[PDB]
Amino acid sequence: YTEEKETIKINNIMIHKYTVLYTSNCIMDIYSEEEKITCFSNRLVFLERGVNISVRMQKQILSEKPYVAFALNGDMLRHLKDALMIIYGMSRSMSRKIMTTEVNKTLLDELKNINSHDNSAFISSLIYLISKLENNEKIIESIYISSVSFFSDKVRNLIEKDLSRKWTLGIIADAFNASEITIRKRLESENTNFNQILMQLRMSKAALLLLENSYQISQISNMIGISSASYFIRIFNKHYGVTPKQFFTYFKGG
Amino acid sequence: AYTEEKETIKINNIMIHKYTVLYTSNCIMDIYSEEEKITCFSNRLVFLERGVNISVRMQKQILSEKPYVAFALNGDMLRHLKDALMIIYGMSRSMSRKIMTTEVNKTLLDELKNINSHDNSAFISSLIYLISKLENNEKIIESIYISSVSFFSDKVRNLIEKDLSRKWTLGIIADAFNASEITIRKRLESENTNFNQILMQLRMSKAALLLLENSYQISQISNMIGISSASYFIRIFNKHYGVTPKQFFTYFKG
């Protein structure tokens, strides 16, 4: 159905990598921490690492993917933070975490020429683009804030070692030399818990593997640690608010 | 009859005290140093390593404009630019690695036109952006690195720059460094200069810059740099550069 191919609402997206998104083919409402940030078409979007957002997207042209996104891996992000410090010196609201800006003509050119196979060129383009943006303080702040490795990041790193394993709070506490209460209370001071972390890791991986179109749902369910393919579909639909099929159809066409 | 072509000038004993990116807006320039030659044609960027001594033969196309547009990085700027370049590209003698030219396309020229020498962070971003767009850019980053390290003749120059008018001597330099004259002469010889050359290159560089400001009379400039007589200044300047203060001035301003 054609209205299903333009408009989708997706809940509980966790931004695990610092992300620059260009709304090439969509208008997008971002809902996080009871705020609403509408990004129109042809705007840049900077999503701080660690935000959990819900998104309502409306495509401009139905036959093409909604947006083009750049996710910085942890290395890239470190170097980019380091260079930004040297260039600008050393030194929260949802609006300090998710920011939208207009992209002019030339920026749009360098935006399209991004290599993403060449680290040095890619950091150079980002530095260039950041310098050309006004009020780029909030954006540099955002890159800084997102470069510090919190405790929930150690927990994610532990879990990412073996995403299929049947993790428990006890297992986490063993691996860290603490009691369950210590880890719970340490994760509670960052407003998460262990189940939240584990579910967001599994569901992020599952989303990404779905878009490859190279693994069967039963395969994806096993790769992320869920016993049943029919149970994974229940969980994914409960989590994201759309089914693997509908999710996939939105980003890879019908 | 010696008909002087005012498009053409030959200038000897130029010491590049600051890392310099030069765009040949209105000239072709033959660079002669260390018995080597590098011709830079019109519409080219020229990267001049800090510390090279060159002779230049310049041919203007249009007499009403200055031969070139140059960006000389002060010691601060160069520091940061090298540091950020190390983070973006990683850590790591012939004339061909010291002076390099590349062709200037549309995009490069566009950012070239917007370089703000009042915003340091914008300026380093521009140089970073521009360096990324150059092929064979290894030689250039090598050159920026080499030119960032403070050699001993740089310590001597820092001492002298404090009071360029003082009647400096090798002995005075040797006291200030807690060393013998032979140590300083030989330390300066292992960097291919001597104390008299450093002092002459400092005065004549300053005198060149002051001439181009067009705000000081020759006798003022001579006194500001430490030369007793204005007529003696003209003698020294002409012997050093191979051109008189009047002819030099006319070539770069009006």
Short mmCIF file of C-alpha atoms in Angstrom, two decimals, chain B residues 31-159:
data_model
loop_
_atom_site.label_atom_id
_atom_site.label_comp_id
_atom_site.label_asym_id
_atom_site.label_seq_id
_atom_site.Cartn_x
_atom_site.Cartn_y
_atom_site.Cartn_z
CA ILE B 31 62.21 29.47 -7.42
CA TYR B 32 65.99 28.85 -7.20
CA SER B 33 67.38 27.37 -4.01
CA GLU B 34 70.20 25.02 -3.16
CA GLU B 35 71.18 24.94 -6.88
CA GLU B 36 67.69 23.60 -7.79
CA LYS B 37 64.85 25.24 -9.73
CA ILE B 38 61.06 25.01 -9.38
CA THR B 39 58.93 27.01 -11.77
CA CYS B 40 55.48 27.88 -10.44
CA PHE B 41 53.14 28.90 -13.24
CA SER B 42 50.03 31.08 -12.88
CA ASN B 43 47.04 29.73 -10.94
CA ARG B 44 49.06 27.44 -8.69
CA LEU B 45 49.35 26.97 -4.97
CA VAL B 46 52.90 27.08 -3.64
CA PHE B 47 53.79 25.46 -0.31
CA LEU B 48 57.00 26.98 1.03
CA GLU B 49 58.56 25.12 3.94
CA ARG B 50 59.56 27.38 6.84
CA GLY B 51 63.29 28.16 6.77
CA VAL B 52 64.17 27.74 3.07
CA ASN B 53 66.34 30.45 1.54
CA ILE B 54 65.30 31.01 -2.06
CA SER B 55 65.98 33.33 -4.91
CA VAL B 56 62.94 34.15 -7.04
CA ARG B 57 62.50 35.39 -10.63
CA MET B 58 58.98 36.78 -10.95
CA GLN B 59 57.12 37.81 -14.10
CA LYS B 60 53.83 39.63 -13.53
CA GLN B 61 51.05 39.33 -16.11
CA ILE B 62 49.31 42.57 -15.06
CA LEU B 63 51.37 45.42 -13.59
CA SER B 64 48.50 46.99 -11.62
CA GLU B 65 48.22 44.08 -9.18
CA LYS B 66 50.56 42.46 -6.73
CA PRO B 67 52.20 39.29 -8.10
CA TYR B 68 50.59 36.83 -5.71
CA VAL B 69 48.40 36.15 -2.70
CA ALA B 70 50.24 34.61 0.25
CA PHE B 71 49.21 33.03 3.55
CA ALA B 72 52.02 33.02 6.10
CA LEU B 73 51.20 30.98 9.20
CA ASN B 74 52.42 32.36 12.52
CA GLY B 75 54.07 29.96 14.96
CA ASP B 76 50.85 29.30 16.87
CA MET B 77 48.73 28.46 13.81
CA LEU B 78 51.45 26.19 12.46
CA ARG B 79 51.65 24.31 15.79
CA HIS B 80 47.94 23.50 15.83
CA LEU B 81 47.87 22.68 12.11
CA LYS B 82 50.67 20.14 12.57
CA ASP B 83 49.01 18.61 15.65
CA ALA B 84 45.62 18.20 13.98
CA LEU B 85 47.37 16.85 10.88
CA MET B 86 49.05 14.23 13.06
CA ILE B 87 45.72 13.11 14.51
CA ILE B 88 44.00 13.05 11.09
CA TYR B 89 46.87 11.37 9.20
CA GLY B 90 49.04 9.74 11.89
CA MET B 91 52.49 10.42 13.34
CA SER B 92 55.79 10.24 11.45
CA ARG B 93 66.14 17.35 2.68
CA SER B 94 66.01 17.66 -1.12
CA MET B 95 64.48 20.88 -2.46
CA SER B 96 61.63 18.98 -4.13
CA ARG B 97 60.16 18.07 -0.74
CA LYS B 98 60.41 21.67 0.55
CA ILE B 99 58.69 23.70 -2.16
CA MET B 100 55.71 22.17 -3.92
CA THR B 101 53.19 23.48 -6.43
CA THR B 102 49.79 22.11 -7.40
CA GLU B 103 47.12 23.28 -9.80
CA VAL B 104 44.16 25.19 -8.42
CA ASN B 105 40.74 23.98 -9.55
CA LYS B 106 37.36 25.64 -8.98
CA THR B 107 36.55 24.07 -5.60
CA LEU B 108 40.03 24.64 -4.10
CA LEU B 109 39.98 28.22 -5.36
CA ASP B 110 36.57 28.77 -3.76
CA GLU B 111 37.74 27.93 -0.27
CA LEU B 112 40.97 29.75 -1.10
CA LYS B 113 38.93 32.93 -1.63
CA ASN B 114 37.17 32.63 1.75
CA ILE B 115 40.25 32.14 3.97
CA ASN B 116 39.74 34.48 6.91
CA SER B 117 43.03 35.41 8.53
CA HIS B 118 41.07 36.68 11.58
CA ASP B 119 39.51 33.30 12.52
CA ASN B 120 42.23 30.78 13.42
CA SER B 121 39.89 27.81 13.70
CA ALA B 122 38.25 28.58 10.33
CA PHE B 123 41.71 29.05 8.78
CA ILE B 124 43.11 25.69 10.02
CA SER B 125 39.89 24.01 8.92
CA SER B 126 40.38 25.54 5.46
CA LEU B 127 43.99 24.40 5.30
CA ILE B 128 42.95 20.95 6.50
CA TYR B 129 40.15 20.92 3.93
CA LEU B 130 42.50 22.05 1.17
CA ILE B 131 45.31 19.63 2.11
CA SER B 132 42.86 16.69 1.98
CA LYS B 133 41.90 17.64 -1.58
CA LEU B 134 45.54 17.52 -2.81
CA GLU B 135 47.09 14.39 -4.27
CA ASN B 136 50.63 13.42 -3.25
CA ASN B 137 49.80 15.39 -0.15
CA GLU B 138 52.38 13.40 1.84
CA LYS B 139 55.24 15.72 0.84
CA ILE B 140 53.19 18.71 2.03
CA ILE B 141 52.35 17.25 5.42
CA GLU B 142 55.99 16.23 5.84
CA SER B 143 56.91 19.84 5.10
CA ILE B 144 54.44 21.23 7.66
CA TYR B 145 55.83 18.79 10.24
CA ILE B 146 59.50 19.65 9.61
CA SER B 147 58.69 23.35 9.68
CA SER B 148 56.96 23.02 13.10
CA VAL B 149 60.02 21.78 15.01
CA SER B 150 61.97 24.59 16.69
CA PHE B 151 65.63 24.37 15.64
CA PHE B 152 68.47 26.07 17.47
CA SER B 153 68.68 28.94 14.99
CA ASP B 154 65.01 29.43 15.97
CA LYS B 155 66.03 29.91 19.59
CA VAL B 156 68.67 32.38 18.39
CA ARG B 157 66.11 34.23 16.27
CA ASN B 158 63.69 34.36 19.22
CA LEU B 159 66.43 35.97 21.30
#
